[PDB]
Amino acid sequence: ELRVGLEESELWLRFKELTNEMIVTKNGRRMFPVLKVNVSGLDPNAMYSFLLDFVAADNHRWKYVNGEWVPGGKPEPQAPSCVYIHPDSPNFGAHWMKAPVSFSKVKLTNKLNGGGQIMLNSLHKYEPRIHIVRVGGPQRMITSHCFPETQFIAVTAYQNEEITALKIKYN
Ligand SMILES: CC(C)n1cnc(S(N)(=O)=O)c1
Numbered sequence: 419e420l421r422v423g424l425e426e427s428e429l430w431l432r433f434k435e436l437t438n439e440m441i442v443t444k445n446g447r448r449m450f451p452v453l454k455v456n457v458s459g460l461d462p463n464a465m466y467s468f469l470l471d472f473v474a475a476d477n478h479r480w481k482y483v484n485g486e487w488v489p490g491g492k493p494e495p496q497a498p499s500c501v502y503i504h505p506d507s508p509n510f511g512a513h514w515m516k517a518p519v520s521f522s523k524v525k526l527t528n529k530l531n532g533g534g535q536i537m538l539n540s541l542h543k544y545e546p547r548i549h550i551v552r553v554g555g556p557q558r559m560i561t562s563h564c565f566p567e568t569q570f571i572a573v574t575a576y577q578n579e580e581i582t583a584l585k586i587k588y589n
């Protein structure tokens with residue numbers, strides 16, 4: 419069976435228990451922590467691409483009011499995020515299973531830009547999601563996996579200083 423697991427869940431859970439925040443910039447900012455995924459049960463000889471996207475967890479705008487994150491009362495439909503292709507893609511199952519698949523080069527932006535960057539609505543809450551796409555074979559197949567532990571609010575600067583301190587402590 420195709421098993422997908424989050425590497426460093428212990429560390430993600432420290433961020434999540436504080437409400438995690440990720441910076442977005444016009445040029446794009448890399449994530450900390452980095453999403454690293456443990457994958458087993460691929461065909462070592464089959465061909466796969468690893469895709470990353472961000473699902474809007476709710477339809478609301480969030481604001482840091484008196485030391486606490488609180489959703490707006492005016493929900494709107496959230497357009498789905500664009501997909502980031504892991505740069506090792508396409509690659510053999512063996513490649514993907516020999517070390518954690520690390521999305522260290524994805525950049526989160528708040529502006530429609532050239533290419534590569536993922537465009538996120540600031541003050542929206544996001545749940546990272548991967549797609550494992552079997553390619554080149556006759557039978558195309560997709561397996562998707564969400565990572566609740568990795569939820570965050572896109573922010574142009576850190577609201578909760580406890581997040582700022584954790585980010586520095588573990589980088
Ligand atoms: C606003 C943000 C979440 N977004 C960026 N691109 C999309 S799209 N056209 O649905 O791929 C949505």
Ligand SMILES: CC(C)n1cnc(S(N)(=O)=O)c1
Nearest residue numbers: 540541572573574575576577
């Ligand atoms: C640009 C606009 C959406 N915004 C206002 N404040 C933030 S912040 N620093 O992320 O809380 C973003």
